[PDB]
């Protein structure tokens, strides 16, 4: 009938159920609609680095063809960051479709993987080499001290 459980949903019941128990301590998860398991928001509150203390909200939506294709993720907190743009698009390789760089998406990846990836964007996966926001990397390059001040100003305005 129209009462048969999809491929995406069967995966998501399991993946969402295990999600909160396996979050980084720095992360929290919210589902604005409990039926829409393909839809949630993530808050990352870093405990170290340049973005320590900021709160950074992410919206992720998992497409109908999920786990063959990665979840779509947007960042909602305006930020001065080399891998996250001011308008909120993200450079996380785990979210690409793996070509030569077999570091892209794979069916073996789960929602738990994505969250740990986003969380790292403020720590170990924060990189100014091959950034998405070239202006921010340039800024960090020319004047690290003023860069931090812009970051701090943005946190104070949009992420507090």
């Amino acid at each position: 009938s129209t009462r048969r459980v999809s491929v995406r949903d069967k995966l998501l019941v399991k993946e969402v159920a295990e999600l909160e128990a396996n979050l980084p301590c720095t992360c929290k998860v919210h589902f604005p609609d409990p039926n829409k398991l393909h839809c949630f928001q993530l808050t990352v509150t870093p405990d170290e680095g340049y973005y320590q203390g900021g709160k950074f909200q992410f919206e992720t939506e998992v497409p109908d063809a999920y786990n063959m294709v990665p979840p779509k993720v947007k960042c909602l907190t305006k930020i001065w960051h080399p891998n996250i743009t001011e308008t909120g698009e993200i450079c996380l390789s785990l979210l690409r479709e793996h070509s030569i760089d077999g570091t892209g998406w794979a069916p073996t990846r789960t929602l738990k993987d994505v969250v740990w990836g986003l969380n790292s964007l403020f720590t170990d996966l924060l990189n100014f080499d091959d950034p998405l926001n070239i202006e921010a990397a340039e800024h960090h390059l020319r004047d690290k001290e003023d860069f931090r001040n812009k970051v701090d100003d943005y946190i104070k305005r949009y992420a507090r």
Partner: protein
């Protein structure tokens, strides 16, 4: 596809009870969902705070009340299941 026996007038809580207390199952903190009219409906998920709080009032509702038809498959997951296990609903 495993089987479960419940009446249409049985509360959703009783299903959660069987899942938790059965000597073969013994789910720790299970999620219970079903597809109705193309879209997933989360009946009860005790593992996600924001969903558990919003779906907790479904526990007093009867299976009939929730819109479940005889023979319907429920998608349930738990810590103790490696992947989602389906359950076939037998209306006694």
């Amino acid at each position: 596809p495993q089987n479960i026996q419940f009446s249409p007038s049985a509360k959703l809580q009783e299903v959660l009870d069987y899942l938790t207390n059965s000597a073969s199952l013994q789910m720790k903190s299970p999620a219970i969902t079903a597809t109705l009219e193309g879209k997933n409906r989360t009946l009860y998920m005790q593992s996600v705070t924001s969903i558990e709080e919003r779906t907790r009032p479904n526990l007093s509702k009867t299976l009939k009340e929730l819109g479940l038809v005889d023979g319907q498959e429920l998608a349930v997951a738990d810590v103790t299941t490696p992947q989602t296990v389906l359950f076939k609903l037998h209306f006694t």
